């Protein structure tokens, strides 16, 4: 059964979302007067 | 009867008598128009001002249709927003490249 | 200075890996592939023809091998002398299509059905003169089967017994599926869809101790895909359409036990988790069955894009993390989407791997091991590092 | 008004031609069609663009 | 080397130097205020006494500039000539000018310090003896004018290359060329050293680690498909993610959190070094904005982590730690968040220290893996955990109402797992 | 989409699109609602098929407008996805016209797919 | 930490057996059990003004060095016995100097294009060559074209090379009956 | 009033095919339908599609 516990952890992931060259481009236009947390927000959005 | 119009004909909207004399004879057309004035046109540098006139008269294309031909139409400018939007990140992200090496 | 919250700190100065390393992996990193390349399966004896059909035996290290020249090879693989085990030429009967078959019954069985377009399939019983059989007799059912050529092999239980058997299921002319016995050669069930068929899959799913189900996925061009339940007659039981999707040439399904992954033991039959539909446009919707099996419009979970022809391969790996698209249509089309990320690895194939104009393509059930062959006959073998 | 319908119609026919020229002079992979009688023509490869 | 080589050599060492009038006018026109016909013709008091006038508007704004109207702004620093003192005094006035740019580098919005730091421009001449100093504390303002005032007088680095073209013209530097700056690694040495004196002097503020932190995760994004880069950039990155969570500033600790997630789902770190990163978020957590960002990176952490044990526990130290910072009243209030943020593996991970560690509080874990749903591996572990400690001692009302959630969802799994290891009618008659 | 009038069915719609696909291998279609209208006002269009995806439809809904003004077919396909793959590019196509040649390949199944939507009008 | 310098000298010879800083000096000697013997130069700092932590890393200076295994063959290069060429079971085939040791030089294994344009095929990571069983030199046309014609263990080709440019030549030599080089020749 | 579904029998080789009679069966969910080929086809209503055909 360890090749079946092996493919059900194989089996049991999730689409996660990858860094691409551009993707962080677009925050320079909008750090600008904002908050810290607002921005790791704005990060995580596009991480999930 | 803008709203039945193409959007390249909305960009050259303005400029008739150059874009008829350079298609009579086998010039150039003009680019801007009537558009020309508009403030992201005016926000453009360069001759990405004649790109994001191409692609605001896309969009006020889209939105203009919408806004003549729709019937549960909100008066709240959402069409207009969001594709104001899109003129906004596309004329970002052509004016944050430059055609200099670094 | 200093003679000897700083955690982050001590465990940088001491490590000079920052990633994990060998069997702490256990699944594919993405965008990079591990990937080398061995001799050529067939190095050893030239095809005569292109490679239509390419399949790797269950259990045994061997590879079939067949095209147009009607013969079909069988290679001992390794990577360092892929020696051809034996060669049998069946004259005037081009094969499309070929296939190793191994039963649940005993694992004991080891037919080989060749196919093509003849009005006749060919079962080469193996146990190493050769003993072959041509099922000929399409048993009252004549008028909706003019070939052979699209056939794919699958289990069935008979479910008033709990016996297994192998069916052929040939793709006909109207719409149909004409699922024969394998071992008789009896007609034993028809499943008709609407529109012009194109292609079809098995989606095996378990049920208890020792009984499975099995679930027919056939499409149409249009996109609109029907699901037939067939351990008990051949009744419909979904109905979907594939969003987008306008001419399909290829379906196939994955991460459990499909017909080019095939398990060995009753018990070891799982439930095929990613379905992906490739279309003539070269575009690859992707589905994942853990939840899009009820809506009856279902969403892809991406639509890979990649490759501009028509799609006319597409396999997912034995333990469901990669799938390989490729088009039989422009030279050097295949690429290796990695799944559930659904992006497309960088690093191969790169623009000088000898891929030619890939017309099959076949993953090996255990070792990882790629085999893509060609229009000039030309089966290259690489083997996937990562397991 | 016959004039006009005339010139109009070879006006039509010269954009046509024109047109199909610069559609040739593209990119994309395509074949020369001949057909009965002479009439050329150019059939493209079934190929989506990027 | 050619002789004109060997010359240059002595040109850029005695660049500074006033040798003739005619090198005076052309070193003397570098103003940050003024143009070239004006700035020629002033003389050393009008700008000295107009920026002590500035200095102390400045210092009436921020009140630890009075120490450089002690030296550096003082009336006997008009005739403190700069190349005229040895190498000893040169370094202790160019510290105490390093001192006054990183105080200064906050307050470049508004026109008191553009008077006040010209006149370090104009005495001791900092556009070219102090330079990287003053472009790393102006480096936010790119976009503004202040940056286009240093760059059309400054003479250039050669870390700072990239901005070459730049240099006297009318578009400030663009994104993409702030980025291909940072993509150095020497440069990000440079940098995270200035960032180690910005945070050991405590002078860190916000518009400046929100140009730090975009430009960091945007170089992570720009070498992310090459491996071997990451790997040169690992000890850079993640040991200033190190100095920026040991402060005390939510600001630069919430930095230090974007940081350490975009890193982490760019490539994947070693269980060892995700372990320590997490201990040191933990280790100086003060407010509730760096305890959000702290969970939600430490989820994120967690959960980009492949391989066999990365569901195991959170060790003894790190859990008792983490349930300092975070109750699990905290974390029953993160979960019952309707946005779903995927925290499989760190629950998973959560559960099992708790049923290895804790050994009193059940019905919690109960809850929580109620509001969050996990995965099949993950619940199969957990089970296994809750079988051995049902082993280990008397399985009370807790332990068994775990049991029977455990058999209502999925009784086939909690079967498979004691055929693995135990019997059906033992741990019934153990129940 | 409720106005979205003459709505094809499965096999119409199958039909419409393997011309649209064979037109497109010839070259013989304009893709895009702007290049669509355009054809419409040269009067060089065979007939126009829309989509009815369009998520603000009123993109759309001004070409049956002036296809009413100039007796030309028009019809309706479900998805916007599909027709952008059958045109054989890689974006969503919201309207494609095809374009009139007379020593075209697909000459017949050009007329007989646009009698087939003028007799649902 | 600053940097290291990976695999500088072969582990299985011994590692790097002594490294050592020339005192005063930014340069260092290591020297390891496969007969070598180099330097490495710390550059000065790239940054102006700090220059103590942005550390510019190690770079290659001056290097000595030798085969590894012993050789399998020797062959005089030219009548005034000043250089040999050397090749050994490391797969490399050095020319050695008689007369000074400072002009002993690997001969280079960077191949040429292709004559038409076809790809070369071949790994990518690089290896050198098989190790040499035979080779045979007449530089009667040297500098002209390709002067040395060497014979590799189990292949079924001899390649050329290059005495004067010190490198491969543009050309394999194959046996065309399917059988590994036994011996070469070349005519004077 | 549009059309749902369309179904297509299994057409002659050497004539054109016409459906004469469709029926429809309540009990069962399914259209019973004769056609010029001589086969009587039994359509699931709902999936719009065979379930057995008779060449009776």
């Known amino acids: 059964d360890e090749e079946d516990i092996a493919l059900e952890f194989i089996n049991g992931e999730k689409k996660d979302k990858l860094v691409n060259m551009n993707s962080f481009t677009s925050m320079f236009d909008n750090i600008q007067n904002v908050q810290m947390d607002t921005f790791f927000d704005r990060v995580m959005k596009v991480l999930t | ?102 | 200075d200093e003679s000897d919250i700083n955690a982050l700190t001590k465990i940088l100065s001491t490590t000079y890996n920052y990633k994990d390393t060998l069997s702490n992996s256990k699944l594919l990193p993405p965008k990079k592939l591990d990937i080398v390349r061995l001799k050529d399966a067939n190095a050893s004896h030239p095809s005569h023809s292109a490679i239509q059909s390419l399949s790797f035996h269950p259990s045994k290290p061997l590879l079939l091998t067949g095209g147009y020249d009607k013969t079909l090879r069988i290679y001992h693989i390794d990577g360092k002398t892929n020696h051809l085990v034996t060669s049998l030429h069946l004259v005037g009967s081009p094969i499309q299509t070929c296939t190793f078959y191994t039963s649940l019954s005993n694992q004991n069985q080891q037919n080989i059905f060749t196919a093509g377009r003849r009005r006749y399939m060919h079962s080469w019983d193996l146990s190493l003169t050769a003993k072959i059989e041509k099922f000929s007799r399409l048993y009252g059912h004549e008028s909706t089967q003019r070939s052979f050529e699209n056939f794919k092999v699958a289990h069935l239980q008979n479910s008033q017994t709990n016996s297994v058997h192998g069916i052929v299921l040939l793709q006909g002319n109207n719409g149909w599926i004409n699922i024969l016995h394998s071992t008789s050669g009896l007609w034993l069930m028809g499943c008709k869809i609407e529109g012009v068929i194109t292609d079809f899959c098995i989606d095996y799913q378990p049920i208890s101790r020792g009984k499975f189900r099995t679930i027919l996925i056939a499409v149409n061009a249009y996109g609109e895909v029907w699901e037939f339940d067939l351990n008990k007659n051949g009744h419909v039981i979904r109905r979907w359409k594939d969003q987008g999707g306008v001419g399909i040439t290829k379906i196939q399904v994955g991460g459990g036990t499909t017909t080019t992954c095939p398990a060995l033991q009753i018990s070891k039959i799982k439930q095929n988790r990613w379905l992906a539909v490739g279309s003539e446009s070269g575009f690859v919707n992707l589905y994942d069955r853990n939840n899009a099996m009820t809506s009856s419009t279902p969403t892809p979970v991406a639509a890979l894009d990649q490759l501009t022809t028509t799609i006319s391969n597409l396999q997912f790996s034995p333990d469901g993390q990669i799938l390989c698209m490729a088009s039989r249509a422009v030279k050097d089309a295949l690429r290796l989407v990695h799944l559930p990320s659904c992006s497309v690895f960088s690093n191969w194939p790169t623009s000088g791997t000898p891929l030619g104009k890939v017309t099959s393509v076949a993953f090996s059930p255990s070792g990882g091991l790629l085999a893509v062959g060609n229009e000039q006959g030309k089966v290259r073998l690489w083997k996937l590092n990562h397991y | 008004v016959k004039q006009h319908l005339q010139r109009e119609t070879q006006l039509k026919q010269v954009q046509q031609r024109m047109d199909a020229q610069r559609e040739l002079l593209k990119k994309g992979s395509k074949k020369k069609i001949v057909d009965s009688s002479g009439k050329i023509s150019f059939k493209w490869k079934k190929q989506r663009k990027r | 080397s050619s002789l004109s080589d060997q010359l240059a050599q002595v040109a850029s060492n005695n660049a500074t130097v006033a040798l003739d009038r005619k090198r005076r006018q052309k070193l003397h026109s570098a103003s940050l205020i003024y143009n070239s016909k004006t700035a020629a013709t002033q003389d050393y008091d009008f700008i000295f006494e107009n920026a002590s006038k500035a200095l102390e508007e400045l210092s009436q704004i921020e009140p630890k500039f009075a120490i450089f109207s002690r030296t550096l702004f003082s009336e006997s620093s008009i005739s403190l000539d700069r190349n005229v003192q040895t190498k000893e005094e040169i370094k202790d006035l160019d510290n105490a000018i390093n001192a006054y740019l990183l105080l200064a580098s906050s307050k470049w919005y508004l026109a008191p310090t553009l008077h006040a730091t010209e006149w370090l421009v104009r005495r001791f001449q900092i556009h070219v003896k102090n330079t990287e100093m003053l472009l790393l504390s102006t480096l936010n303002y790119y976009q503004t004018p202040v940056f286009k005032r240093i760059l059309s007088i400054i003479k250039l680095p050669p870390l700072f290359n990239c901005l070459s073209n730049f240099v006297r013209s009318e578009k400030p530097p663009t994104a993409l060329t702030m980025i291909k700056l940072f993509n150095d690694m020497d440069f990000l040495k440079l940098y995270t050293s200035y960032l180690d004196q910005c945070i050991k002097h405590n002078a860190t503020y916000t518009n400046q680690l929100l140009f730090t932190t975009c430009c960091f995760i945007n170089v992570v994004a720009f070498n992310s498909n090459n491996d071997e880069k990451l790997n040169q950039l690992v000890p850079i990155l993640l040991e200033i993610s190190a100095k920026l969570l040991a402060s005390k500033s939510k600001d630069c600790q919430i930095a230090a959190h974007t940081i350490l997630v975009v890193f982490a789902t760019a490539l994947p770190l070693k269980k060892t070094i995700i372990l320590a990163a997490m201990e040191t978020i933990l280790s100086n957590l003060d407010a509730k904005e760096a305890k959000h960002s702290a969970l939600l990176t430490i989820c994120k952490l967690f959960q980009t982590l492949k391989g066999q044990g990365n569901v195991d526990q959170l060790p003894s130290k790190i859990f008792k730690l983490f349930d300092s910072k975070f109750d699990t009243v905290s974390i029953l209030t993160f979960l019952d968040k309707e946005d779903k943020p995927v925290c499989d593996k760190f629950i998973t991970s959560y559960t099992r220290s708790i049923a290895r560690y804790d050994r009193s509080k059940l019905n919690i874990i109960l809850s929580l893996l109620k509001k969050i749903r996990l995965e099949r591996y993950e619940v199969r572990l957990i089970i296994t955990d809750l079988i051995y400690l049902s082993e280990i001692l008397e399985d009370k009302s807790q332990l068994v109402e775990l049991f029977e959630y455990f058999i209502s969802i999925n009784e086939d799994l909690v079967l498979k797992c004691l055929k693995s290891l135990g019997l059906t009618g033992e741990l019934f008659e153990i129940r | 989409n409720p106005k979205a009038f003459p709505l094809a069915d499965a096999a119409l719609t199958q039909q419409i699109l393997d011309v649209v696909q064979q037109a497109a291998n010839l070259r013989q279609l304009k893709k895009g609602a702007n290049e669509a209208t355009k054809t419409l006002n040269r009067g060089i269009s065979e007939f126009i098929i829309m989509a009815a995806d369009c998520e603000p439809i009123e993109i759309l809904l001004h070409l049956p407008l002036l296809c009413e003004d100039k007796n030309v077919p028009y019809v309706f396909v479900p998805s916007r996805v599909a027709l952008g793959r059958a045109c054989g590019v890689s974006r969503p196509v919201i309207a494609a016209s095809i374009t009139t040649n007379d020593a075209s390949a697909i000459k017949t199944q050009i007329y007989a797919v646009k009698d087939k939507i003028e007799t649902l009008l | 930490r600053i940097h290291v310098l990976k695999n500088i000298h072969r582990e299985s010879y011994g590692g790097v057996t002594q490294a050592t800083f020339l005192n005063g000096q930014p340069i260092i000697v290591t020297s390891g059990g496969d007969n070598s013997l180099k330097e490495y130069v710390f550059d000065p700092s790239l940054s102006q003004g700090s220059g103590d932590v942005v550390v510019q890393p190690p770079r290659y200076l001056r290097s000595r060095g030798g085969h590894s295994q012993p050789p399998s063959y020797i062959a005089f290069a030219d009548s005034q016995s000043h250089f040999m060429l050397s090749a050994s079971k490391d797969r490399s085939l050095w020319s050695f100097s008689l007369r000074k040791d400072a002009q002993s030089q690997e001969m280079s294994q960077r191949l040429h294009k292709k004559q038409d344009g076809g790809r070369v095929g071949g790994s990518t990571i690089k290896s050198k060559f098989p190790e040499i069983v035979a080779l045979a030199i007449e530089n009667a046309r040297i500098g002209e074209w390709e002067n040395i014609i060497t014979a590799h263990k189990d292949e079924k080709f001899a390649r050329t090379w290059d005495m004067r440019n010190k490198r491969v030549g543009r050309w394999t030599f194959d046996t065309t009956d399917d059988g590994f080089v036994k011996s070469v020749a070349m005519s004077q | 009033g549009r059309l749902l579904h369309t179904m297509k029998v299994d057409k002659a080789k050497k004539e054109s095919t016409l459906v004469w009679s469709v029926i429809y069966l309540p009990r069962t969910d399914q259209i019973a339908s004769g056609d010029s080929t001589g086969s009587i086809k039994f359509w699931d209503f709902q999936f719009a599609t065979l379930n057995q055909s008779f060449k009776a």
């Open chain 2, 1 to 102: 009867s803008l709203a039945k119009s193409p959007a390249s004909t909305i960009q050259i909207l303005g400029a008739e008598k150059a874009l008829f004399r350079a298609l009579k004879t086998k010039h150039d057309t003009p680019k801007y128009g009537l558009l020309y004035h508009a403030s992201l046109v005016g926000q453009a540098t360069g001759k990405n001002k004649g790109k994001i006139a191409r692609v605001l008269a896309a969009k006020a294309a889209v939105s203009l249709r919408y806004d003549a031909l729709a019937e549960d139409r909100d008066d709240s400018g959402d069409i207009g927003l969001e594709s104001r939007a899109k003129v906004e990140n596309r004329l970002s992200q052509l004016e944050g490249r430059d055609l200099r090496t670094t």
